[PDB]
Structure 1
Amino acid sequence: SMNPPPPETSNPNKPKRQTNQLQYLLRVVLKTLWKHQFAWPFQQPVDAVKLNLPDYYKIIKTPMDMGTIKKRLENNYYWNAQECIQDFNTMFTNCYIYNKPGDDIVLMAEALEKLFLQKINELPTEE
């Protein structure tokens, strides 16, 4: 009945850089998702203790959430856009793996995911 430590959002041993793609991921993609009415359950790590889901971190071994992604972007954690995109993908996939197809949280995820894909489609070329 304990949560794991949340994913790191900074690491002095991990190389980082700014790219126009990462800037787009923060200012366009993250910002757009963050303000969506269905965003709030994804704005921080899943609190399996409070939700009384004792099997959550037994099934989900690579947790990820938009709060973590937001901080990673703001804190200049990433080296490239692929790292950040993978984190988004992990967030959605986890939700679909743990929850049932009909569940409210899945329908909320699906709405955010559609939006994410619409924005990621126009990711700028690196320059």
Structure 2
Amino acid sequence: STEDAMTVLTPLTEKDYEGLKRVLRSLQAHKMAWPFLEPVDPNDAPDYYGVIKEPMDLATMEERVQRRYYEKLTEFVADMTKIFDNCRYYNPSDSPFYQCAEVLESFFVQKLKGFKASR
């Protein structure tokens, strides 16, 4: 589709970045986002950094947005998907963190579709 191709190929503009910030702030404000605001503490999660190859959290994404790290929407989506995929990979499906990942990714997908349509 056009949205698929734009996501992979169209460089993010200044206006795009304002939308990225709105999406990120919406995720940070969500009731289920608190496990993802800051990096996992090793005292909360034995072996976490040895198991998870590419850790990610919303504070790292915020820094990257502020530094204009992302050139394509795909890269932003990839970092966000790391947050949820890492959580579900490390934790069993009955973990409360796994449940938060399910809810918050669903919210992200809704917001992401709105952002793609706006471009």
**Could you state the TM-score of these two structures normalised by the residue count of structure 1?**
0.76
**Post-superposition offset of 1:125:** 5.7
**Post-superposition offset of 1:44:** 1.0
Is the counterpart of residue 38 in structure 1 residue 35 in structure 2? no
More helix by proportion, 1 or 2? 2
RMSD: 2.0
Q: 2:47 aligns with which of 55, 76, 88?
A: 55
- Tell me the distance in 1 between the aligned counterparts of 2:15 and 2:88: 30
8 Å contact 2:12–2:73 — kept in the other structure? Answer: no
Q: 2:66 aligns with which of 59, 71, 74?
A: 74
What percentage of aligned pairs have identical amino acids? Answer: 37
8 Å contact 1:44–1:67 — kept in the other structure? Answer: yes
Deviation string 1:31-85 (CA, Å, 9 cap, x unpaired) is 111011221210111111x31x331111101001111111111221211211111
* TM-aligned CA distance change 1:63 to 1:79, over 3 Å: same
- Tell me the distance in 2 between the aligned counterparts of 1:105 and 1:17: 31
- Aligned to 1:78, what secondary structure does the other structure show? coil
2:116 paired residue number: 124
- Tell me the distance in 1 between the aligned counterparts of 2:32 and 2:53: 24
- Aligned to 1:83, what secondary structure does the other structure show? helix
Which structure 1 residue ranges, 5 or more long, are not aligned? Answer: 1-15
- Tell me the distance in 2 between the aligned counterparts of 1:20 and 1:82: 16
Which structure 2 residue ranges, 5 or more long, are not aligned? Answer: 1-10
Aligned residues: 109
**Could you state the TM-score of these two structures normalised by the residue count of structure 2?**
0.81
- Aligned to 1:46, what secondary structure does the other structure show? coil
Read off the aligned partner of 2:19 and give its amino acid letter.
Y
- Tell me the distance in 1 between the aligned counterparts of 2:92 and 2:14: 37
2:4 paired residue number: none
